[PDB]
Structure formats: C-alpha cells, structure tokens
Predict the structure of S2-1, Wednesday.
Amino acid sequence: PXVXXEXK
C-alpha cells in the first residue's frame, strides 16, 4: 500500500 512497487 502507498508505495506501490511489487505491491505494498
């Protein structure tokens, strides 16, 4: 969540 990336 929030960060994006590989799925945060």
User: Anything to note?
Assistant: Residues 1 and 7 are 7 Å apart (CA to CA). The radius of gyration is 4 Å.
